[PDB]
């Protein structure tokens, strides 16, 4: 799938963020920001 950016963290791999803006894998919370669906890279 896509990873989603948090807009200005260093891209968050290899975490796989969800819609809420983090990993459900112990990494990135429920930040729930303008998160940006990033996959050419
Ligand atoms: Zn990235
Ligand atoms: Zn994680």
């Known amino acids: 799938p896509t990873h989603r950016h948090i807009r ?3 891209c968050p791999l290899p975490h ?3 819609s ?3 990993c ?3 990494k990135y919370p429920n930040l729930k920001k303008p998160t ?3 996959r050419g890279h």
């Open 20 to 22: 809420l803006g983090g």
């Open 8 to 10: 200005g963290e260093a």
């Open 24 to 26: 459900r894998c112990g």
């Open 16 to 18: 796989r963020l969800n």
């Open 36 to 38: 940006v669906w990033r």
